[PDB]
């Protein structure tokens, strides 16, 4: 009697493939927006709060320097990012509203989520209760079920990339390492604390790395610190591969069981990667109180609503040093980014 998840995902794949095969391009330009303030920075670019001049709507504009992208060998990853983000559609994925490029930069204009990064809230509060952590985790489970059904691996789960909207739900950002792949891939990418052992060990790997990263995220949300931490990445990797994991004394029996199964070095035993796929996670005892339908439909009351001061207030974000956006008089890296 329920709406079938299988049938829902089949229709969603039809929708995705149409956009994957015919991507949108050149849907705004820089002078349509006033640039306000930097919201975040990453290894590859900066995200700015902007205001559309005609409508007054605020957006979050990611700006990538084409020459920096080439130097860091991220051309194909950046093309993946934009092609995937413009084609996906799910309640917990940030919307790409416009994209464009100029002589110097690539621009992805996304919906602005003023509630701030989960990272900020998690560090301030210390740790989330298990019900709070489970509410967020359920959204990631559904999001990965969706992405994986489209043959997409995400590859950069972490609280820094999860924004909290005004309903208290998650919006996943940063598709810089997302890739559409049937079978295995090999790129060493991610964030150290979240890398699965098979990435570190230079094995071919598949979507199971996202389920490992979910285990890391759940652990970090509920503990307040990640399962494998050290001062330098190299010591983190040694802990990951060991891959002994210890739990806070306050973790429930069911949470420990789920995490041992997500943080399983043996791919043939890792939840999400067995015969029953995601259903081993959704049907796990730790999720017994999760109404998966109600989460997808955003009908569950969230544990926390960010302070609202908008429409363009940035008080839930840190401050960053501002650097002028320079547009050269000469086109840079035109051939590399033709399809953007």
């Amino acid at each position: 009697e329920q709406e079938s998840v299988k049938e829902f995902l089949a229709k969603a794949k039809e929708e995705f493939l149409k956009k994957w095969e015919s991507p949108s391009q050149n849907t705004a330009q820089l002078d349509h927006f006033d640039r306000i303030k930097t919201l975040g920075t990453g290894s590859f670019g900066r995200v700015m709060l902007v205001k559309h001049k005609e409508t007054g709507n605020h957006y979050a504009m990611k700006i990538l320097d084409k020459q920096k992208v080439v130097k860091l060998k991220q051309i194909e990853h950046t093309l993946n990012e934009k092609r995937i983000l413009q084609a996906v559609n799910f309640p917990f994925l940030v919307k790409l509203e416009f994209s464009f490029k100029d002589n110097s930069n690539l621009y992805m204009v996304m919906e602005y989520v003023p509630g701030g990064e989960m990272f900020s809230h998690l560090r301030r509060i210390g740790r989330f209760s298990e019900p709070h952590a489970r509410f967020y985790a359920a959204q990631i489970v559904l999001t990965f079920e969706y992405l994986h059904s489209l043959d997409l691996i995400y590859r950069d789960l972490k609280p820094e990339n999860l924004l909290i909207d005004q309903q208290g739900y998650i919006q996943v950002t940063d598709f810089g390492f997302a890739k559409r792949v049937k079978g295995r891939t090999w790129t060493l990418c991610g964030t150290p604390e979240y890398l699965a052992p098979e990435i570190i060990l230079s094995k071919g790997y598949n979507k199971a790395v996202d389920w490992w990263a979910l285990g890391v995220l759940i652990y970090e949300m509920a503990a307040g610190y990640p399962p494998f931490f050290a001062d330098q990445p190299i010591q983190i990797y040694e802990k990951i591969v060991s891959g002994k994991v210890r739990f806070p004394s306050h973790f429930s029996s069911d949470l420990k069981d789920l995490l041992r199964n997500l943080l399983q070095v043996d791919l043939t035993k890792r939840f999400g990667n067995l015969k029953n796929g995601v259903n081993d996670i959704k049907n796990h005892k730790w999720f017994a109180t999760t109404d998966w339908i109600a989460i997808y439909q955003r009908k569950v009351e969230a544990p926390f609503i960010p302070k609202f001061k908008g429409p363009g207030d940035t008080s839930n974000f840190d401050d960053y040093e501002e650097e002028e956006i320079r547009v050269s008089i000469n086109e840079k890296c035109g051939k590399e980014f033709t399809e953007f």
Partner: peptide
Amino acid sequence: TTYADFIASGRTGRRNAI
């Protein structure tokens, strides 16, 4: 405590991708 060791570590701020 593990918490205290984390908080005294150098990786409590935002972590960049490799």
